[PDB]
Write a protein that binds this ligand. Structure first.
Ligand code: HEM
Ligand SMILES: *[C@@H]1O[C@H](CO)[C@@H](O[C@@H]2O[C@H](CO)[C@@H](O[C@@H]3O[C@H](CO)[C@@H](O)[C@H](O)[C@@H]3O)[C@H](O)[C@H]2NC(C)=O)[C@H](O)[C@H]1NC(C)=O
Ligand SMILES: *[C@@H]1O[C@H](CO)[C@@H](O[C@@H]2O[C@H](CO)[C@@H](O[C@H]3O[C@H](CO)[C@@H](O)[C@H](O)[C@@H]3O)[C@H](O)[C@H]2NC(C)=O)[C@H](O)[C@H]1NC(C)=O
Ligand SMILES: *[C@@H]1O[C@H](CO)[C@@H](O[C@@H]2O[C@H](CO)[C@@H](O)[C@H](O)[C@H]2NC(C)=O)[C@H](O)[C@H]1NC(C)=O
Ligand SMILES: *[C@@H]1O[C@H](CO)[C@@H](O[C@@H]2O[C@H](CO)[C@@H](O)[C@H](O)[C@H]2NC(C)=O)[C@H](O)[C@H]1NC(C)=O
Ligand SMILES: [Ca+2]
Length: 595
């Protein structure tokens, strides 16, 4: 049996072969099958999907349906018993800057987004779901287990809506349900430019032929650009402080305002596009408005890639880097560049790297003002602290000089995210990202832990003693067993994250494998990979190889002191040097010598 057909919600457009620029949607990257790695299509299944009813119901939907003969435990109950911790002392990655957490979220955002199903704005699937906690259709509420303190203050559940799926977004009934990636699978700064035409243009400055992205005309940062604000009302950035009335930003990606440091990095990207475009017109004064946009956008895309594969992945994998991402050997069109459904959970290792507070630091890197450090939760959907506090600048210094959270088998996810998450259609700082992630694993039909162990050539523990051995942790294993009753039922997010953290890396073996494999394909199956012969000239590639996040900071802020290796843990002033000492990006090689 088999089904190749289904790809109905897609406008299938021309591929201008030889074009030297990526499309916005990601179509036409791969020539044999030009929908490969395009946005708005069904994420890839490395392993057949696993639902309660074979088709679409997330294990845990039916109380009289076991998984392998055992009920699956409530997501919130796994959160409470395994994921949570009280004492934030001692949980600071000694050798990773806070930038390390933040880049990961940036890369994640470039690569995947599975939007909640939306059949109703003015429809009571939302209200009935939130108010009365009745599971049905796309309402899959996260129920509190006996003894939960949120029972006392928040109700019977936290709302949760099932992710969008292809074919139709009303129910289906032939193939297994397949969730959508709404963004492009190819690491191509789609978070900045958008993955759809409608937005990419709306993002553009089509008032002038300079190839610039649209900037805030309401607020400014020492004459440095801010991102435009967004249309949407209701606005959750507004709802955060209804007095200040500062809305969310508008970026290539809709999540850019989830937290202030994400919105900051987005700032650390729009700026550079425009810097790059201005420098480019200055040099090639005959170039189109379009041409300037595309060639900046190309260089930016190349920056995301280089920072990611040269600086980030080596330190997020460790020992396994070489085992899954051998040095580049060219473009391979037989490679599938699609983001897999499991990767979208594996990449959520980042959630254990988020610490409980964010600092603003002045130019001696000392607290900035009387409220320099804030609880992370007061910063979900918070632009106003950017616009009417300090710059971006103090936050970027914090990104450099403060540390990531270290994942810890006994202190997984800070309560800032585990109890205080703010959703943008629900009025409280009262949600649990960990619960949500577990529920979503089930929503998405994920195979369990041991299925992924087996996929990656690793042992598949069956017996509580065997699980202790894999996780080198008696007590964690015990709680996992007590709750799941068989490692085969352990949800991939929590299983993958429970494994000790490799060597020199920040993920376990199961994750290294899932992540390495996805990034290898991201790298090998992209026709516009920066390092693919043809995409850039050898000259051009000699200039791009010197880019650095440091350099990005220098050219787009008024920070004049940065470390050389920004992802590592760095302290001021010892690990910092002046922007003078820090390599520039030399665009001589972009000179259009059509003569
Ligand atoms: C708030 C949130 C963060 C920080 C303050 C945060 C951080 C990260 C990092 C650092 C990631 C990678 C290193 C990462 C990956 C992914 N996240 Fe996550 N994250 C915050 C909040 C959320 C929320 C909310 C979601 C949606 C949850 C849902 O299932 O309903 C979320 C998701 C993800 C995600 C899946 C994205 C997708 O493909 O749709 C990651 C890969 N994060 N986060
Ligand atoms: C903190 O983690 C850093 C990385 O953030 C650790 O050091 C990294 O380890 C690599 C080895 O793979 C080193 O890179 C090597 O350096 C030589 C030149 O001496 C160069 O030819 C290559 O680039 C080579 O890979 C390097 O020390 C470092 N890498 C980077 C990018 O910083 C470090 O061990 C940890 N720091 C502390 C204080 O423990
Ligand atoms: C909602 O946003 C408000 C800003 O839009 C914020 O209030 C701001 O923060 C403090 C509160 O006093 C003020 O900072 C200083 O203001 C002047 C300095 O010129 C001093 O008189 C004060 O003592 C103070 O140090 C901001 O000026 C202030 N602005 C306003 C209009 O109050 C709120 O705190 C935000 N509220 C929430 C719940 O997030
Ligand atoms: C689109 O670009 C035009 C041309 O630069 C912008 O107009 C400039 O705006 C800046 C402030 O943003 C001021 O110097 C002048 O108003 C214009 N400068 C020049 C040299 O003409 C316009 O702001 C941009 N529009 C948007 C919405 O970003
Ligand atoms: C591109 O990648 C694919 C991986 O799927 C390679 O194709 C496989 O190559 C191995 C060894 O030659 C064979 O055993 C497989 O059966 C091949 N499968 C297919 C579909 O071709 C391919 O060799 C790689 N190409 C390059 C140039 O590296
Ligand atoms: Ca992308």
């Amino acid at each position: 049996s088999w089904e190749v057909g289904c790809g109905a919600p897609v406008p299938l457009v021309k591929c201008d072969e030889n074009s030297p620029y990526r499309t916005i949607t990601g179509d036409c990257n791969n020539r044999r099958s030009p929908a490969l790695g395009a946005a708005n299509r069904a994420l890839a299944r490395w392993l057949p999907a696993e639902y309660e009813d074979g088709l679409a119901l997330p294990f845990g939907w039916t109380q009289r349906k076991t998984r392998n003969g055992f009920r699956v435990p409530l997501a919130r109950e796994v959160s409470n018993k395994i994921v949570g911790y009280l004492d934030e002392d001692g949980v600071l990655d000694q050798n990773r800057s806070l930038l390390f957490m933040q880049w990961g979220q940036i890369v994640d955002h470039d690569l995947d987004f599975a939007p909640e199903t939306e059949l109703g704005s003015n429809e009571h699937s939302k209200t009935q779901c939130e108010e009365y906690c009745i599971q049905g259709d796309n309402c899959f509420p996260i129920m509190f287990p006996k003894n939960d303190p949120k029972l006392k203050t928040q109700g019977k559940c936290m709302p949760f809506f099932r992710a969008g799926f292809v074919c139709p977004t009303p129910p289906y009934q032939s193939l297994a349900r397949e969730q959508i990636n709404a963004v492009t699978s190819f690491l191509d700064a789609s978070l900045v430019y958008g993955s759809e035409p409608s937005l990419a243009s709306r993002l553009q400055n089509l008032s002038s032929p300079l190839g610039l992205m649209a900037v805030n005309q309401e607020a400014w940062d020492h004459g440095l650009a801010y991102l435009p604000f967004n249309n949407r009302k209701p606005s959750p950035c507004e709802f955060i402080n209804t007095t200040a009335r500062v809305p969310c930003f508008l970026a290539g990606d809709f999540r850019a305002s989830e937290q202030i440091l994400l919105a900051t990095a987005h700032t650390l990207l729009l700026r550079e596009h425009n810097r790059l475009a201005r420098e480019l017109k200055k040099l090639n004064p005959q170039w189109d408005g379009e041409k300037l946009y595309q060639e900046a956008r190309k260089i930016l895309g190349a920056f995301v890639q280089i920072i990611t594969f040269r600086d980030y992945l080596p330190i997020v994998l460790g020992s396994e880097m070489q085992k899954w991402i051998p040095p580049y050997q060219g473009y391979n069109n037989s490679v599938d560049p699609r983001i897999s459904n499991v990767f979208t959970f594996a990449f959520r290792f980042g959630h254990m790297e988020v610490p409980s507070t964010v600092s603003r630091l002045d130019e001696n890197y000392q607290p900035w003002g009387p409220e320099a450090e804030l609880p992370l939760h007061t910063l979900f959907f918070n632009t106003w602290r950017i616009i009417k506090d300090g710059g971006i600048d103090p936050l970027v210094r914090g990104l450099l000089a403060k540390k990531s959270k270290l994942m810890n088998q006994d202190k997984m996810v800070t309560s800032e995210l585990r109890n205080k998450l703010f959703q943008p259609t629900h009025k409280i700082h009262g949600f649990d990202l960990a619960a949500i992630n577990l529920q979503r694993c089930r929503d998405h039909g994920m195979p369990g832990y041991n299925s992924w162990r087996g996929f990656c050539g690793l042992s598949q523990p069956k017996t509580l003693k065997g699980l202790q051995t894999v996780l080198k942790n008696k007590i964690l294993a015990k709680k996992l067993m007590d709750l799941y009753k068989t490692p085969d039922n352990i949800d991939i997010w929590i299983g993958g994250n429970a494994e000790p953290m490799v060597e020199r890396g920040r993920v376990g073996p199961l994750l290294a494998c899932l992540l390495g494999r996805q990034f290898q394909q991201i790298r090998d199956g992209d026709r516009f990979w920066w390092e693919n012969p043809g995409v850039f000239t050898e000259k051009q590639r000699d200039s791009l190889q010197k880019m650095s996040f440091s350099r990005l900071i220098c050219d787009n802020t008024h920070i004049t002191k940065v470390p050389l290796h920004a992802f590592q843990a760095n302290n001021y002033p010892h690990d910092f040097v002046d922007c003078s000492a820090v390599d520039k990006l030399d665009l001589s090689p972009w000179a259009s010598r059509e003569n």
